[PDB]
């Protein structure tokens, strides 16, 4: 009924803003918040949320490294980034991320990607593909 979300984002202001933006949805719930890749691995393996919103660049373990450790859990991982760095896209796919979006994408589109991913779809931003 209600989609359980874990958010991993090292920048506290953004972490808080994302949680607030997603808690505004009727069919969604932020069940945990983290600032490192390890926080994501620990919560997802233990609490098993439906979805994990994962930042890439975080201290300790990156979101891509966290995504690799969670490749065979049943959690649907959506990556968020600001800049498309080379090979992040291929590493994301190979880790089995279900979504790869821009942080600054309108909030309506992030909630839509969470629903689409829960419906078995893979949502990749065209900007983040390494062909325009």
């Amino acid at each position: 009924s209600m989609i359980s979300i874990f958010i991993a984002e090292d920048q506290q202001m953004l972490l808080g803003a994302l949680g607030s933006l997603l808690n505004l949805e009727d069919d969604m719930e932020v069940v945990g918040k983290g600032t490192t890749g390890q926080d994501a691995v620990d919560f997802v393996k233990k609490r098993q949320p439906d979805v994990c919103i994962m930042d890439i660049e975080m201290p300790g373990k990156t979101g891509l490294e966290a995504a690799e450790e969670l490749k065979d859990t049943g959690c649907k991982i959506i990556i968020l980034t600001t800049f498309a760095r080379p090979g992040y896209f291929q590493r994301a796919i190979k880790a089995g991320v279900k979504g790869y979006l821009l942080k600054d994408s309108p909030s309506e589109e992030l909630a839509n990607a969470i629903r689409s991913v829960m419906n078995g779809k893979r949502i990749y931003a065209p900007e983040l593909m390494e062909d325009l």
Partner: protein
């Protein structure tokens, strides 16, 4: 004889080549500092703006709180883009006068390199004001085809000369010539004028 010049050129090019790499090394750095500052801040603005709009009616108090952060991160981010450099205002005036003279079909003769890098920010701002006025006078009155601006560090002064090849039209309180002289003299500087072959203003300020 000419091998002096041949080798001298070869040296300047090999030097200019190394410069490009240093430029590109600093450029590489600045881009990394932008993606870490501007990127995060612009991303945050969008999200908080989205949230603020979504709370207008639900919780206007929170929307206001969020809009305060949005205005703050924007002011700092603009302040952070200014914080890539420490500064020169006379270089900005140089750009203004080039535009003004070109728009007036007056040939502008100057050299970007000679521009003094050290003068107090106050004295730099006074010189900018005087440079603007000297050129406004060229445009409004001279009917010149050419305007020459010289900027030199001579002993304990910065000396700016503005010359034109038009004709002097003068024979006063509240106007530019006396205005510039009074402002310069208050700063222990000077303004001299020669109106024989067109008009030439020599303005000096301590440094």
């Amino acid at each position: 004889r000419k091998e002096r010049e041949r080798l001298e050129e070869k040296l300047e090019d090999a030097n200019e080549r190394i410069a490009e790499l240093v430029k590109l090394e600093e450029r590489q750095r600045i881009a990394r500092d932008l993606e870490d500052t501007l990127g995060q801040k612009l991303s945050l603005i969008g999200l908080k703006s989205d949230l603020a709009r979504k709370l207008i009616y639900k919780d206007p108090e929170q929307a206001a709180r969020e809009l305060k952060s949005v205005q703050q991160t924007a002011r700092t981010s603009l302040n952070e883009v200014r914080k890539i450099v420490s500064g020169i205002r006379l270089k900005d005036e140089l750009i203004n006068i080039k535009q003004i003279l070109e728009a007036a079909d007056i040939m502008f003769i100057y050299e970007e390199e000679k521009w003094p890098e050290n003068i107090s920010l106050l004295n730099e701002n006074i010189l900018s004001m005087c440079l603007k006025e000297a050129v406004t006078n060229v445009v409004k009155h001279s009917q010149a085809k050419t305007c020459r601006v010289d900027i030199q560090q001579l002993w304990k002064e910065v000396v700016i000369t503005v010359s034109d090849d038009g004709t002097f039209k003068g024979e006063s309180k509240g106007h530019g010539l006396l205005g510039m002289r009074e402002r310069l003299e208050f700063a222990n500087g000077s303004l001299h004028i020669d109106t024989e072959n067109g008009t030439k203003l020599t303005m000096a300020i301590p440094n």
